[PDB]
Design an enzyme around this catalytic site. Structure first.
Site, PDB file in Angstrom:
ATOM      1  N   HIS A   1     -47.387  11.176  15.244  1.00 33.82           N
ATOM      2  CA  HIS A   1     -47.060  10.597  16.616  1.00 33.82           C
ATOM      3  C   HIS A   1     -45.267  10.646  16.466  1.00 33.82           C
ATOM      4  O   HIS A   1     -44.619  10.222  15.573  1.00 33.82           O
ATOM      5  CB  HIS A   1     -47.368   9.487  16.833  1.00 33.82           C
TER       6      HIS A   1
ATOM      7  N   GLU B   1     -56.222   9.458  16.252  1.00 32.67           N
ATOM      8  CA  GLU B   1     -56.632   8.726  17.276  1.00 32.67           C
ATOM      9  C   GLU B   1     -57.346   9.325  18.386  1.00 32.67           C
ATOM     10  O   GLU B   1     -58.266   9.187  18.705  1.00 32.67           O
ATOM     11  CB  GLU B   1     -55.294   7.979  17.620  1.00 32.67           C
TER      12      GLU B   1
ATOM     13  N   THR C   1     -50.613   3.059  21.567  1.00 25.00           N
ATOM     14  CA  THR C   1     -51.915   2.934  20.976  1.00 25.00           C
ATOM     15  C   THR C   1     -51.965   1.634  19.866  1.00 25.00           C
ATOM     16  O   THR C   1     -53.054   1.401  19.511  1.00 25.00           O
ATOM     17  CB  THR C   1     -52.311   4.070  20.122  1.00 25.00           C
TER      18      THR C   1
ATOM     19  N   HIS D   1     -51.112   8.030  11.631  1.00 30.68           N
ATOM     20  CA  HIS D   1     -52.278   7.375  11.610  1.00 30.68           C
ATOM     21  C   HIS D   1     -53.396   8.124  10.724  1.00 30.68           C
ATOM     22  O   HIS D   1     -53.537   9.332  10.985  1.00 30.68           O
ATOM     23  CB  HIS D   1     -52.908   7.228  13.138  1.00 30.68           C
TER      24      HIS D   1
ATOM     25  N   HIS E   1     -44.685   8.822  13.126  1.00 30.31           N
ATOM     26  CA  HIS E   1     -45.322   8.029  12.105  1.00 30.31           C
ATOM     27  C   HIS E   1     -46.740   8.656  12.227  1.00 30.31           C
ATOM     28  O   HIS E   1     -46.871   9.534  13.156  1.00 30.31           O
ATOM     29  CB  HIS E   1     -45.511   6.499  12.431  1.00 30.31           C
TER      30      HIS E   1
ATOM     31  N   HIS F   1     -48.283  -1.528   9.238  1.00 25.99           N
ATOM     32  CA  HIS F   1     -49.362  -0.744  10.045  1.00 25.99           C
ATOM     33  C   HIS F   1     -49.524   0.473   9.673  1.00 25.99           C
ATOM     34  O   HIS F   1     -50.629   1.121   9.566  1.00 25.99           O
ATOM     35  CB  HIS F   1     -49.025  -1.017  11.554  1.00 25.99           C
TER      36      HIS F   1
END
Ligand SMILES: COc1cc2c(cc1OS(N)(=O)=O)CC[C@@H]1[C@@H]2CC[C@]2(C)[C@@H](OS(N)(=O)=O)CC[C@@H]12
Ligand SMILES: COc1cc2c(cc1OS(N)(=O)=O)CC[C@@H]1[C@@H]2CC[C@]2(C)[C@@H](OS(N)(=O)=O)CC[C@@H]12
Ligand SMILES: [Cl-]
Ligand SMILES: [Zn+2]
Length: 257
Positions: free
Chosen positions: A116, A103, A195, A93, A91, A61
């Site tokens: 995050h 996000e 999330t 996004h 990590h 992911h």
């Protein structure tokens, strides 16, 4: 097998994780004009000096840098937080294009990526027990914009070639997360959720107002990662972000102004 594709993306999550349509879901759009300064907020304390990174993993992911949280080392305290929260992993996004990837959004603005740093409330003993509590986690979110390179991120960028596919991990010791922070600790905070599935509503979100700058080359290497595992058709790891969810009467508080 949940993911970010058309057939396993955010719009499908509610079927296996009904809380996806809950009352305290994340991320959310931060309407700066509606956010109110909160004098009750105590000074935020980010103590990462003794942080002990252990490994970096491509989990299919995103990629995650894990830390040794067996002891009180890298911790987050103060602000809206009661007690001590231990850093367990961080990590990102990101998007397939610079105009998207974050996000949380600010006045509907999408940043190129979002970092995050995940912490768990030590009063609950471990991460698993923490995610069974309404105040079990604290995630420090930091926006990334494309411009000058972030020196403190390069070590992460250069190891990505060794964890290209899902399931791959690599030793990643002595990485100091303090090199990923912006100068200012001004922030917005609100009660939310994870999330990604299981989307548990156990998070106190602390989103920094000042974004960090990363180079186009650095984010381009994020985009070379794979959602797929080794020996499988390549599907670039991009756009692994969940869109803004309904605020549902929650109030976003500002630590400033
Ligand atoms: C199911 O509940 C837990 C999950 C995790 C840990 C402890 C947990 O509680 S428990 N089993 O009761 O001790 C400790 C390590 C954690 C892992 C959850 C997944 C994490 C957050 C990983 O992130 S990932 N790979 O993106 O999912 C990095 C460290 C991992
Ligand atoms: C309940 O314990 C888990 C949590 C998470 C995962 C697996 C977990 O164990 S289990 N029993 O297999 O469900 C796998 C994905 C993880 C998530 C915890 C929250 C994470 C770390 C997310 O962090 S975020 N975006 O700040 O909410 C990114 C990946 C997420
Ligand atoms: Cl796709
Ligand atoms: Zn995240």
């Amino acid at each position: 097998h949940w993911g970010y594709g058309k057939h396993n993306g955010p719009e499908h999550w509610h079927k296996d994780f009904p809380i996806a349509k809950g009352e305290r879901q994340s991320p959310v759009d931060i309407d700066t004009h509606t956010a109110k300064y909160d004098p009750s907020l105590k000074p935020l304390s980010v103590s990462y000096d003794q942080a002990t990174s252990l490994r970096i993993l491509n989990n299919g992911h995103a990629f995650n840098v894990e830390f040794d949280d067996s002891q009180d080392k890298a911790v987050l305290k103060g602000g809206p937080l009661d007690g001590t929260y231990r850093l367990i992993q961080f990590h990102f996004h990101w998007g397939s294009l610079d105009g998207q990837g974050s996000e949380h959004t600010v006045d509907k603005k999408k940043y190129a990526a979002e970092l995050h740093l995940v912490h768990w409330n030590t009063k609950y003993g471990d991460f698993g027990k923490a995610v069974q509590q309404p105040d079990g986690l604290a995630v420090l979110g930091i926006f990334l914009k494309v411009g000058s390179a972030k020196p403190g991120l390069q070590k992460v960028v250069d190891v990505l070639d060794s964890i290209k596919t899902k399931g791959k991990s690599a030793d990643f010791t002595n990485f100091d997360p303090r090199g990923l922070l912006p100068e200012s600790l001004d922030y917005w905070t609100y009660p939310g959720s994870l999330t990604t599935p299981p989307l548990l509503e156990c998070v106190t979100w602390i989103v920094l107002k000042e974004p960090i700058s990363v180079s186009s080359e650095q984010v381009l290497k994020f985009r070379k990662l794979n959602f797929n595992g080794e020996g499988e058709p390549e599907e670039l790891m991009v756009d692994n972000w969940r869109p803004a969810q309904p605020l549902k009467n929650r109030q976003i508080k500002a630590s400033f102004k």
